[PDB]
Structures are given as structure tokens and as C-alpha cells.
Amino acid sequence: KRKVVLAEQGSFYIGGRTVTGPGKFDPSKPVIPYSNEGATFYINQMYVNFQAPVRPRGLPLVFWHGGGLTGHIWESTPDGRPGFQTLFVQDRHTVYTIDQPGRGRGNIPTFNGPFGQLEEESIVNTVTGNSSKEGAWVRDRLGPAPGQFFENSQFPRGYEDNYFKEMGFSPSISSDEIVDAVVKLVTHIGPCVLVTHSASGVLGMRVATHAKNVRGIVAYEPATSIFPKGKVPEIPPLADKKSQIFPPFEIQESYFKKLAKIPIQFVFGDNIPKNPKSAYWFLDWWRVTRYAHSLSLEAINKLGGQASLLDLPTAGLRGNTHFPFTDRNNVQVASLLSDFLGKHGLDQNESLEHH
Amino acid sequence: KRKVVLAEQGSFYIGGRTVTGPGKFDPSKPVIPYSNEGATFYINQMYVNFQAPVRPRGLPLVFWHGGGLTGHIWESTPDGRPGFQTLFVQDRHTVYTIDQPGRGRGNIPTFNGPFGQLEEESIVNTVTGNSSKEGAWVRDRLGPAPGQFFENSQFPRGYEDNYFKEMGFSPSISSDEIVDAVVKLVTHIGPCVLVTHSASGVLGMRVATHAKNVRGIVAYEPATSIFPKGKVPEIPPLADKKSQIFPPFEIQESYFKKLAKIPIQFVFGDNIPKNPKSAYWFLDWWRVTRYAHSLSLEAINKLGGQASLLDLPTAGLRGNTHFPFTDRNNVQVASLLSDFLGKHGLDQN
Ligand SMILES: COc1cc(Cl)nc(NC(=O)NS(=O)(=O)c2ccccc2C(=O)O)n1
Ligand SMILES: COc1cc(Cl)nc(NC(=O)NS(=O)(=O)c2ccccc2C(=O)O)n1
């Protein structure tokens, strides 16, 4: 089912700030090589793409890629099957896909000088970090070790090169500025649903506490848990007796309470072990991270919330990776997202696209 | 008219290579913080988006952004009007839009360490360059100085912030590897037309000399001229008597003459002066660069080619900037591109 009919499509930039270099710009002096002198730089802006079907229904969906990724992951799978962008435009939702600040078509703040440095000011760090193919293989649970697949895997085997090519580094932009850009987007588009992934899990939770327009969250395998300030439960270290999960993000309880006002679903794939797994660091990391999220959701529900954890194996889907929405069964994964939208009345009424 | 009917859409990665770190990867060791140890990295790959109409008519178009840009510039204008992607899908062409290696969704090659450095090897330079808003204002000929517009301007005034936000740095990926990625895309697509802009002007010319599937080129304000090796004409310096245009790219004549086998059109907007202008460096730069391109096109035609220069004011369009395809009259600019495709049979199956 590849055909798509759009009432309109396009893209735009939103958010960000400006920084300035020293002095004044003289149009008579050679402009190349580029100089910081007299410069204004736009930094930390976000790229947004939208596609609106004919006669939209329900709330628009905002798909927010995980760490080191772009909106590509919602457009197509590594082997070329339709991504959730196409599937949900066909499902009659207006679909927004973003490249957050520091990723893809979002801004990478660098100037004339060492990476990220504007004269004496470090806007982002010159030293970068970036996962290897091997680190991503085990992070994404293709298998327990690079080159190996779980026998039940839903990964599109044969398209490893395509898959890993979509991943890259992120400069050290503050999470505050990333959240700020998406808050501005959701304010502009109206009531909407956030669909997040991995690193954008905690960021989407934060956006919701700042923006009443977020009416629901579906988070695919969020990477960082969130708790009210001062009320982070003790969580055991990993099986290696040394490592820990990502330090949970703490927000003031007045903001945390807003998470109890909308439906929230965390979706996990397969092959996260139940038992401690000292031989496979990322498998063990996912075990304890999933547990931490269970405690986070419990805190939301004790405030009157509607927060749930969906393990795809319990719904009859086996072998999903950390990217269920590009796996071979992503149509069945999409159906469960449609079910969430229908359960909570988020697919109702004629809707108009605006930003 | 914003409606579009797509038989299919999607995106993929193509091209690139791999580099490796030292040692072995042990899955029992902490994976975070990320390490180069035992690492394989995919670098210099290109992002490609495609949209195919129902019943495509004529060759697919490959829209290739200029320097510091992305495929966004073909999707929408800064004020939110349809870009050439929509306009030419409506015109029944399959449309490819790329983010070249180093830009947008293309790969930026960096690792665990100083930007661009893999252990002791510099894959790209740690020191970056990037235009300011001020430099882009005058490069793009919005006006002669930042904050000023030419009075005839087709720029979408009021949307300056949207416009400049689309621009950014490019790492020092070799032009050879950028050309390589697009050659591989042209192999994948089959016969096609390249529609280039500024920095990708010279790169698209190079691609055509390596890819016979390029059946035509339309280049919006190419930034670097190209000549047969040993046959670069002397070109005068700029009015400040010290600056020069970008050193022209030289290729073997036997590659260069492949450019004579396909139609090629260079498109220039407005407000490039005829007189030397010492007060306005980028205006003078565009004057001498347009002249160099005129000699480049002459070299192609001397070899039996079909190369031409279209000044938009001669076609009745006044006030265009360096981005005619996002200006307020971009529908009329698009009509001139359709005219080129029709003249050369590139809108026919
Ligand atoms: C890199 O180092 C640190 C340290 C700390 Cl404390 N927190 C983060 N945040 C992330 O979500 N980092 S991630 O972005 O690569 C990621 C990690 C695990 C699992 C998944 C992801 C991810 O791809 O989203 N990264
Ligand atoms: C920066 O310094 C050099 C040196 C040399 Cl030799 N060649 C280039 N190539 C470009 O096209 N550089 S550009 O990318 O910023 C650009 C410049 C002028 C006019 C237009 C553009 C452009 O945005 O495409 N840049």
C-alpha cells in the first residue's frame, strides 16, 4: 500500500536563538573565507516536515526520532518499506516529522574556528561522541553481539548497511533547548500526539509538562526515566556490579502532575532479558531501564494518571528490535498505535492542519 | 495548488565507506560512554528522498542543494509556499531530493574524540567554517548590504529568520566522495536530469562526466566554473584588485567533452552588476563568476555542445535572488525549467 494523497506538504524551521561574533561586517571586504567578524549566527533551530491528508481526522501526530537519528526513520524502513509517516497519512492523520536541533536538518552550532567554538565561547563541545556500528547493534538488540541475530528477529536482514548509515553523532546542545524547540512546535500546531523513541522519550515527557497541546504520548523504548524531584527510587546497578542506567531526570512535582492528565504508553520490543545478564551489557541495561520506567509509570498512575507499559510480545508480536516501527512487522506495530489513538478518542472529528 | 498524489514516497541512504577503530568489541564491557575500540563507522553516506507521481511522464529530476543547504530548499519556500518538489511532482516527474554527504541527513563524519578525528587520523577538519547571516545576505543578493533589499527583490520579505535558519556548515569531506555518492545514485535511478545550485553546480558537471545517465543539467547560479585541463582562460581579479573568483576546476578534455553530449542550462537571477563594484564584494564576485561561466559554456559549445546561459531578467523575471526557486515568483521560474525539459524531450517517456 504505497499510494498517498496529500492535501498539502512542506517543511519549515522553528525555534532556536542567535549568537553574535565581535565587531562589524563590511560588505566591501572579502566575504570568503567566512569570518566571525560582525556575524550573526542562527543556532539550535529545528527542522519540521508535515504531510496532511485530504479530510484529516483526529489529532496530528508528531514523530520524534531517537538518539543520533532523523525523521528518515519514520519515512521508510532500511529495506524500503513504508514508514509510519506514510502509514498514518493513509490512516487519515496529519503527520509531522522533526529533525531536532543538532540532528539531520536541524542546526549544528559551529562557526569559524574549532568545532562548536565562537571565539572564546564554547557553544557545543569540540570533542564529540558517537556510537560504533557494534555499539548500535547491541543497543538495538539485533542480537546479543555484533553480527549475530536473535533467531526470532524482526530486523530486515540484508539491509544492515542502509540501517546503520542513518545514525550519527549529536553535538552537546542542552536538552533544555531541544525541549524548547518542540514546545514551540506543539504550541503552533494545536492539540497533538507525541510519538517518541529512545532518547526523545524523556524529552517528550518534559514537553508535555510545558505544553497542554500534548494530548497523548506513545514512547518506543524510552532511554531515560523521569521522576518527581526528590522522589527517585533506588534502582539496582547492572549485573556487572559497576554500571548503572541513565540517571533519571527529576522535575518538580507541580510539572510531574501534568503527566497524569493525558494517556501515556511506553512500548518495548522483544529479547530484553528477565534475569541479570552480565555477559551482554546492553541487554542488561535494557532490563534495568525497563524496570525503572515501570516505577516511573507507577508514580504517574498514583496521581490519577493513565500510563501503561506495552510489551509487544504480550500483544503477540515476537522479535522486535529497538526500532519496532521499521521492523519487518511494522504494519502490526502501527496497528497497535492506531489502537491507542482509538482507545483515547484521539482519531475523532474533522481536523484542519495549521502551524 | 498544494495537493499532490503520490504513487510512492520514501527515502534511503546510498554511498559512503567505512573506517575502523583499534582493537576488539567486547559486548560485556560498558558500551556507554561510546568508544572507538573495536569500532566500525559508516561515513560520508548520502540521504535521498523520492516522491513518485502516478503515471510519471519523462525523466526523474534530482534536485541538489547548494552550499550549506539541504533538500528543504526544494520542499518549501521560507514563507511556506510549495517548493519545486511539489511543483514538479504535480508536473508528473518523479522527484529526488538529496542531502549530500556532510549536510542535513547526510553523514557528518565524527567519532569519539575531537570533531572529525578518528584516533590519530583526521577524517574531516576539526576547525570549521560557516557563513554568518551577514555573509549569506550579500552572497544571496537580497541586497548590497545586510538588512537592505534591492527594490525589485523577489525575496519573501518578512521571513528572513525562516530563510537563514536553513543554512549551516559543511565539514571538509572531499569533493571526490560527494561526486562518488551522486554517481552511485544516478546508477540506481537510471536516466535523469540534475538540477543543481551554487556549490553543487561544479559537482553536477563532474557527475555528468562520470555518469552517462545524466541526460541534462539545469544549474541555478553555479559557484565554481569548470574547464578542460590546460585550457583555463585568464580571468581578471575583482574590483578590489586583490580578490579572485573561485579557482576553476580542471578536468581532462576527454571527460570535459562528455558535457557536449547533453543539454546544459545555467540560470542566473537579478542584480548582478555589469560594472566593477569595489564597494560590494559579493556583487562584484558574482559579476566575474558569471563571466567565467560564460567562457565555460563557450568551451562546451566549441566541442559541439548545447550549453546556454539564461539570465532571468531577459526572460521577463525581475528581482530574483541567488535562490530563484524559493523566491516569490518561483512558479514562473519553475515554468522556465519545464520549458527546458520540454525543449529537450526530457518530459517524454
Ligand atoms: C551517550 O552518553 C549518554 C549518557 C547519558 Cl547519562 N545519557 C545519554 N542519553 C542518551 O539517550 N543517549 S543515546 O541517545 O546514545 C542512547 C543511549 C542508550 C540507549 C539509546 C540511546 C538512543 O540512541 O536514543 N547518553
Ligand atoms: C568557503 O570557501 C570556499 C572556497 C572554495 Cl575554492 N570553494 C568554495 N565552495 C563554495 O561554493 N562555497 S560556498 O558554498 O560557501 C559558496 C560560496 C560562494 C557562493 C555560493 C556558495 C554556496 O553557498 O554554494 N568555498
Author numbering:
A (entry chain B): 12 to 366
B (entry chain A): 12 to 360
Provide text from the study:
To elucidate the catalytic mechanism of SulE, we solved the crystal structures of wild-type SulE in complex with CA, mutant S209A in complex with MM, and mutant S209A/H333A in complex with MM, SM, TM, TrM, EM, BM, and CE in the range of 1.29–1.63 Å. The overall fold of these structures is similar to that of the apo form, with rmsd values in the range of 0.1–0.2 Å after the superimposition of all Cα atoms. The SulE-CA complex structure represents the binding of the enzyme to the product. Structural comparison showed that CA and CE are well superimposed at the active site, indicating that the substrate and product bind to SulE using the same set of interactions. A water molecule Wat719 was observed near His333. Wat719 formed hydrogen bonds with His333 and the carboxyl oxygen atom of CA, presumably the deacylating water molecule. However, in SulE, the binding of product and substrate at the active site was similar, and no significant product inhibition was observed.
